[model samples]
Target: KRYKNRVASRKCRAKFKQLLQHYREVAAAKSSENDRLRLLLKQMCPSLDVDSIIPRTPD
Candidate 1:
């Protein structure tokens, strides 16, 4: 019935939201780590272009 469909839709929405949140968290962590590595590389090789090595953040 319509009621059952609504319940199923709600469950799907909740699950999707959780997955999206997890992905965002992972992306943020990776972005931070990338920054740390870029800084380290820069310190080791002052002449090197670290920006070329690291991709620009979408944000």
Candidate 2:
């Protein structure tokens, strides 16, 4: 019913926010692992522009 439109929208938005949070958390953790491995490779070799190959974290 139109009476519940706003309530439904709010519920959907809340769930969407939660999903984003979950994705952000997963990305953050995986990003850390990537950085560590990247460092290892850098140590083995060398790269002044590591960022060129591996994108920096969003934050």
Candidate 3:
């Protein structure tokens, strides 16, 4: 019973790490895509600024 429990615990830990890695990968991809969109938007309107679109601080 103890050995079986240990095996299950190891599997759970592996799955948790896999999920964490996947989340990080997704976040990075989205961040890159956001950067690309910002670049395109800047091209469309040269006067536009990133801080203005996404405020740096709440008012």
Candidate 4:
């Protein structure tokens, strides 16, 4: 498996850990409200773009 091959080496494991840390940082920074609103609007309207309606400015 790709995970088994990459995680076998210490250097590769360290790189993967670093990448995961950065990924979490970026992932956490994104707004959950937009995602929730998007899902809600898609379920209800099915036509309107809730993502565009979501505010870009940080609170």
Kindly list the per-residue Cα lDDT of model 1 for residues 1-59, writing each as its tens digit: 99999999998998889989999999999989988888898899999997876667774
Q: Which sections of candidate 1 miss by over 4 Å?
A: 1-7, 53-55
Clashes (N, CA, C under 3 Å) per candidate: 0, 0, 0, 0
Runs of candidate 2 with Cα error greater than 4 angstroms are 40-59
Name the candidate that leads on lDDT: 1
Kindly list the per-residue Cα lDDT of model 2 for residues 1-59, writing each as its tens digit.
Answer: 88699899988998889989999999888989888988887897785567787677675
Q: Candidate 4 versus the native: TM-score?
A: 0.38
Worst 10 residues of 3 by lDDT: 50-59
Query: How far in Å is the alpha carbon of 17 misplaced in model 3?
Result: 1.1
By summed lDDT, which 10 consecutive residues of candidate 2 come out lowest? 47-56
Residue 8 lDDT, candidate 3, scale 0-100: 94
| Alpha carbon deviation, residue 30, candidate 2 (Å) | 1.2
Compared with the true structure, what per-residue lDDT tens digits does model 3 show for residues 1-59? 99999999998998888989999899888878877887888899889888687754321
Q: Roughly what TM-score does model 3 have, to 2 decimal places?
A: 0.71
Residue 31 lDDT in candidate 1: 87
Better of 1 and 4 by TM-score: 1
Cα-based lDDT at residue 3, candidate 3? 100
